[PDB]
């Protein structure tokens, strides 16, 4: 966010694309676990119990 920088543009371009992929994957995984309700079984084994 400072004036015009030839290098700052590529930094904020790669960074913007990176954070875009990150937030997209976050939303996608959140929908994946609000849609897929798979009952996880805790500590079935006796030794871990």
């Amino acid at each position: 966010i400072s004036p015009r920088s030839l290098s700052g543009r590529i930094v904020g371009g790669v960074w913007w694309f990176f954070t875009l992929i990150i937030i997209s994957s976050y939303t996608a995984n959140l929908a994946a676990f609000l849609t897929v309700e798979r009952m996880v079984s805790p500590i079935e084994s006796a030794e871990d119990l």
């Binding site: 996880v40 084994s45 030794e47 871990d48």
Partner: protein, 48 residues
């Protein structure tokens, strides 16, 4: 064999070994103790 002297004593000894735990102990000894795959389920980490 039918009518053998060892029939009933072995029939009782099997139950005696099962109730004592020696049968399960031998099972674990020759299956898991000598088993090549030692990590078994205690170290699998139960990925979740």
């Amino acid at each position: 064999p039918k009518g053998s002297s060892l029939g009933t004593p072995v029939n009782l000894a099997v139950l005696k070994l099962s109730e004592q735990g020696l049968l399960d102990k031998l099972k674990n000894k020759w299956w898991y103790d000598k088993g090549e795959c030692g990590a078994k389920d205690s170290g699998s980490k139960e990925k979740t």
